[PDB]
Amino acid sequence: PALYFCGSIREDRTLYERIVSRLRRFGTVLTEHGDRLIHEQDLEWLQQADVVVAEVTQPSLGVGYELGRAVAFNKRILCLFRPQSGRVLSAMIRGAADGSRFQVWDYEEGEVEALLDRYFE
Amino acid sequence: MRPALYFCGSIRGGREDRTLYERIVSRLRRFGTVLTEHVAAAELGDRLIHEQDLEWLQQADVVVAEVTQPSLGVGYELGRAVAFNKRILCLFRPQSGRVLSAMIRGAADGSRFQVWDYEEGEVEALLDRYFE
Ligand SMILES: CNc1ccccc1C(=O)N1CCC(Nc2nc(-c3cc4ccc(C#N)cc4[nH]3)nn2C)CC1
Numbered sequence: 318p319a320l321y322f323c324g325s326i327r328e329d330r331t332l333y334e335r336i337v338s339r340l341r342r343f344g345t346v347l348t349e350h351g352d353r354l355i356h357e358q359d360l361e362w363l364q365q366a367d368v369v370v371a372e373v374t375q376p377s378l379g380v381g382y383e384l385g386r387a388v389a390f391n392k393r394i395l396c397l398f399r400p401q402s403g404r405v406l407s408a409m410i411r412g413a414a415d416g417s418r419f420q421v422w423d424y425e426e427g428e429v430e431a432l433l434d435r436y437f438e
Numbered sequence: 439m440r441p442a443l444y445f446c447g448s449i450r451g452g453r454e455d456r457t458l459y460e461r462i463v464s465r466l467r468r469f470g471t472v473l474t475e476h477v478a479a480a481e482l483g484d485r486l487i488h489e490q491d492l493e494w495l496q497q498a499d500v501v502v503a504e505v506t507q508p509s510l511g512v513g514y515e516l517g518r519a520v521a522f523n524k525r526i527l528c529l530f531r532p533q534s535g536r537v538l539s540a541m542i543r544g545a546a547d548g549s550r551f552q553v554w555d556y557e558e559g560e561v562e563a564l565l566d567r568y569f570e
Pocket residue numbers: 322323324325326333334337338348349350359377378379380383537538539540541
């Protein structure tokens with residue numbers, strides 16, 4: 318199973334690395350490793366993905382774009398938000414959840430590995 | 439029949455951005471109905487917002503996005519708009535110091551998806567150019 322991961326450029330590099338390390342236990346992570354080429358490559362990975370996992374704690378035009386394109390490709394999507402950051406998640410992302418193919422889970426830093434295990438189990 | 443225009447922008451930049459977005463929307467209103475003109479952005483359950491947003495995106499002839507401020511919502515609207523085969527104009531202010539996301543800049547084809555850099559004072563004249 319091919320897994321897609323994305324997060325904003327903006328602090329918690331270790332937490333993104335931890336997420337990708339955990340996802341690597343469930344399949345290949347396409348995204349583990351001028352602007353037109355970047356866009357085309359991203360869209361190819363989104364289409365190959367069996368599941369899209371986004372870290373949506375920090376605002377990002379790119380992460381939002383990938384999620385909108387992923388919904389339209391009918392991808393299974395999991396968004397991870399950290400309410401301890403103090404921010405309030407965009408209603409466009411929170412409101413896209415249906416509980417099945419599009420899910421938005423709040424989490425605390427310590428439980429992210431166990432939440433991902435429960436998601437794939 | 440009046441063209442239907444969709445406008446979006448982040449709710450995080452500052453009060454001067456709010457007055458600038460009002461000026462963009464005021465100029466857009468000269469060219470068509472602005473579906474999102476009454477969105478009380480500064481004050482921004484969540485499912486109803488998402489569904490009303492998708493209805494407006496699907497009903498638009500052109501989507502105009504102010505992409506200077508990073509925003510998950512603006513990005514999501516743009517990804518849904520591309521998949522809805524919408525004609526799109528992104529407006530970016532390079533004086534902000536930021537470098538626009540390659541996902542947005544790289545989506546441009548110079549025709550149905552364009553990204554235009556601008557200075558706040560020329561926004562009305564730039565919209566006249568696009569909408570003429
Ligand atoms: C100002 N913004 C931008 C400026 C220039 C270029 C892109 C953007 C942009 O909008 N972005 C950045 C790229 C994001 N997508 C993305 N991120 C990742 C990614 C992060 C990451 C971290 C750790 C590890 C490990 N181990 C692996 C990782 N894989 N894969 N992909 C596809 C979307 C948002």
